[PDB]
Amino acid sequence: PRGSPKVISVLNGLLTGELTAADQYFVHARMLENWGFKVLYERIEHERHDELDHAGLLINRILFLEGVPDVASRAALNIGSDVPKMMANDLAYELQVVDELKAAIALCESERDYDTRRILVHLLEETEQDHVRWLEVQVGLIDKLGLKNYLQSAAGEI
Amino acid sequence: PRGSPKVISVLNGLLTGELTAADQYFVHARMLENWGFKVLYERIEHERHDELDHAGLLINRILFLEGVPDVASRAALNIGSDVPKMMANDLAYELQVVDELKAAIALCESERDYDTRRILVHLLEETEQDHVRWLEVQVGLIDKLGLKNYLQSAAGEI
Amino acid sequence: PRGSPKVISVLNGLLTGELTAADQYFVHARMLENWGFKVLYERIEHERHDELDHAGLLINRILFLEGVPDVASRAALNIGSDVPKMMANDLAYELQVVDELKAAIALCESERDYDTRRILVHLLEETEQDHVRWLEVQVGLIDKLGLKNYLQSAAGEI
Amino acid sequence: RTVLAALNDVLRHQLTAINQYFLHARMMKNWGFNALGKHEYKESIEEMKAADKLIERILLLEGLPNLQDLGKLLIGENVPEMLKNDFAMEKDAHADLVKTIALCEKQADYVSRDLLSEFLEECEERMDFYETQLELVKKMGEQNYLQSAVGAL
Amino acid sequence: NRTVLAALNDVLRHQLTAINQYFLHARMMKNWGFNALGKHEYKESIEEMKAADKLIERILLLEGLPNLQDLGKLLIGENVPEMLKNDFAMEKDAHADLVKTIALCEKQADYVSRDLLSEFLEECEERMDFYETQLELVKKMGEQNYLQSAVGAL
Amino acid sequence: XXXXXVXXXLNXXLXXXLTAXXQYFXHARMXXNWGFXXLXXXXXXEXXXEXXXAXXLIXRILXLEGXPXXXXXXXLXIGXXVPXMXXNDXAXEXXXXXXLXXXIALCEXXXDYXXRXXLXXXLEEXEXXXXXXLXVXXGXXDXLXXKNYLQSXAXXX
Amino acid sequence: XXXXXXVXXXLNXXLXXXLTAXXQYFXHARMXXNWGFXXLXXXXXXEXXXEXXXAXXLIXRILXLEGXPXXXXXXXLXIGXXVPXMXXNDXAXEXXXXXXLXXXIALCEXXXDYXXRXXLXXXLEEXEXXXXXXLXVXXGXXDXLXXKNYLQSXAXXX
């Protein structure tokens, strides 16, 4: 089942976005582990695994549509110096991913191909709830708990 | 524990190599699954998970030495069009990885930095035994079984 | 299996260093238990037991090489007054132990005594990961969490 | 008929309490306060079970439960505000329930009275919990109380 | 978007009214002794409250204010056939509102809430089918036989 | 190898079985849509059994080096009411049993005894598991009353 | 209920398609078992059962829309005389079905029938992934493997 060249290009943009997200989440999780924030490292590593799964689903969809999937392309990373900066960067990138996802879903609706719309809606749901929601929750928690208390909770057990 | 700039640089080169390898095996496994070569797909997925573990170890070592992991950089990718081409490309990339790992181990021994040398020796062990051995055996088996018999073996259950 | 006398001498120096580390860690663990910091108490008690295990490894190697262990001799104890001072003192002693271990590993390489080099690399890994990494994490967590929150985490259940 | 009207008013308050507790719990989970959100979810569920018992009692009395009406919802913008709003709603609950229990005793009606008495027991327990929560906020600081209300990250 | 939040609040109000109506109908079915029909109505109520939980979480995640204050007109039946008819009519109104809201959410390219409302619409259509079938069964097999079936175990 | 007459008879019986499967499918879905759940489960099980029988027949036709015509399907008598469905199923089953008896006689004449054994198994199923049950159902709709029978067919609410 | 005439007609068309597919896979699985290709017959039979289930869902939906399920009509079967012809015909039928499904999904969205659209999206996903993909991969395997090797794999255990 050949896909539209526009659908393939938008799926390649989504794939490079998801690969960049996985790479940035990898770096952030490993930095959190280095600083000793154990529970934050667990959560961010699980999010990285989810992003690898998202990239795999996207590349399977691209190959199914007989389009060559580009994974060499990587977007510029936003590595934060401290925990609040890292989570602000993660929230910003997840919002950009959400916007690109919504554009791709609209394109899939226009181009009459609906299995890609289904997988992209699944990806959008995961990005909005599993990733975006947790990040905005944590930014609000930094605001409310305070930096010292939030880092105490993130460190977990010493 | 401050890390020497040369060890940090060679660790970053090896990290770029392992991340490019992870992307290459990920793509190769996905198109192998697309072609119905489920046995090869499963083995290459396992290999790409091992590559992810290797990248994680390298990033942990870089962070411990107070270095900045250049995770945004990705080397050139060689993507095959058929199973023998993937085997040859993976083999060539693995020989490059072995050469770079050997040079990095030599530098680590020369520069008094022994824990990184042990980590890199472990990486070299896994690279030559789990990856290079399998790919050399794979090229030989394609030669000996023939393309059709080897592809039947790779397909497995249909 | 009589070895190089210089290898025996550096092994004796390392054994004295580990014995002094065990003494200092014993005092620090008991002080942490006295102040009510149970989490730190458990971690430091386990670290003291690990120092005893490393001393056992070193003494077994020394006796194997037909050498008289220098167990009577001890280094000066850098005993802290509050928790940050105790952690900083432990970290400084462990860094010095790491430097001594690196010198001894280099000497063992120079004398073609590879089994002692193997045990010294094992000790160096355990000192640079199970001890130094945790101590620098604790110092950073004191800085980030603040002293009051860090001490609350250290105390645990009350 | 007076006992039925009093029971309907108690039911209206209990429905309002259900709505307020559930909305507060959902807001707390939206903000990330998992322990506080879980406790408020449990409190809403207990009030749902209480409303179930009271609807059973009203129907047993051959009355018509008034599930249409609902009291005003005191919705808080931050956690201490929702704590005190829950406390104020529970105080109104306690006053109305005491009046209802006295009325039920006067009318020689005793089964709905022991139902209202157990309802008053849970209501006073919740009143104590919320007053204690407010005093705890004051005692440990809002930052520490919010850290505890978050629970595990 | 403001219109999407208003539509979500309207669907939430419909769901809360349905929750109240279904629970009341279950309670009077159990009061009359219709244990099986009462159990089904209780389960339907619980599912509508789980749906309202999902909708409230969606409204909050959109940085909006859920309106749990409002409630529609409860249609309360004097007997079991009237209960089923009222439930079906309320589901009719809810389904029309759901279809319009799904169209609106599709128009504004807000797809997560559209998927949640698609789930809600699937359950609502199943409820339509169940209540229409129950009324048709009443007509086919007689009110007395249907009431005996609703009782189940005496 | 298999005779032309025998293969034709088998194809006829197969067309019959496929039509019956489609009819049972339709009726089970309508009975489920109407709320009769017990009757629906019974008819669905019956449709599955019909599918199994058709499978056996196709396997037989293919073993006899023939061509199983599944493209064809006979006239389909659908019911509007449960009694109508029951009567239609019974009629179809009676016709099927008649054709089966004819086919068994033909297979005996052509000395195709394995095929005859299969057809005898099929006739036993169509006479016991189907025709008997449907005759019983019609009798019960007559004796219980339409309302009582539909209440029984509805199962539990 | 009170489904649109156009929606009901499209559903009836999709149903005719599903029933024809059921019959075709039935025939094909039986002669695949007859030829000794058990490992292929099992898959074909499972797919036929899946087709039966799909048609059931379709009929249930048509009945819930107050329509008359046309289960009488049937298209022109395409029975293969050899496994390659079999798989090719299956692929062709599934592609035609996917086209019809996309058209029906577009109609269901246009007429604001979202539940039927959900059902059809499920059916289209199943037909694109579980069927069309498998048939395409089989047609590719019976070309990369060769007819002989592929039939040996399809026969499974002798």
Ligand code: HEM
């Ligand atoms: C207005 C009158 C209501 C009554 C009489 C009522 C009653 C009940 C009852 C009896 C339960 C069973 C709990 C258990 O057995 O564990 C329950 C659970 C629940 N209720 Fe309510 N409820 C009402 C309103 C609501 C509302 C408005 C919501 C949400 C907006 C809601 C959300 C829930 C949820 C999520 C559960 C848990 C479901 C489960 O555990 O399976 N309820 N309620």
Ligand SMILES: [Fe+3]
């Ligand atoms: Fe993602």
Ligand SMILES: [Fe+3]
């Ligand atoms: Fe690697």
Ligand SMILES: [Fe+3]
């Ligand atoms: Fe030591």
Ligand SMILES: [Fe+3]
């Ligand atoms: Fe604190």
Ligand SMILES: [Fe+3]
């Ligand atoms: Fe009866």
Ligand SMILES: [Fe+3]
């Ligand atoms: Fe072979």
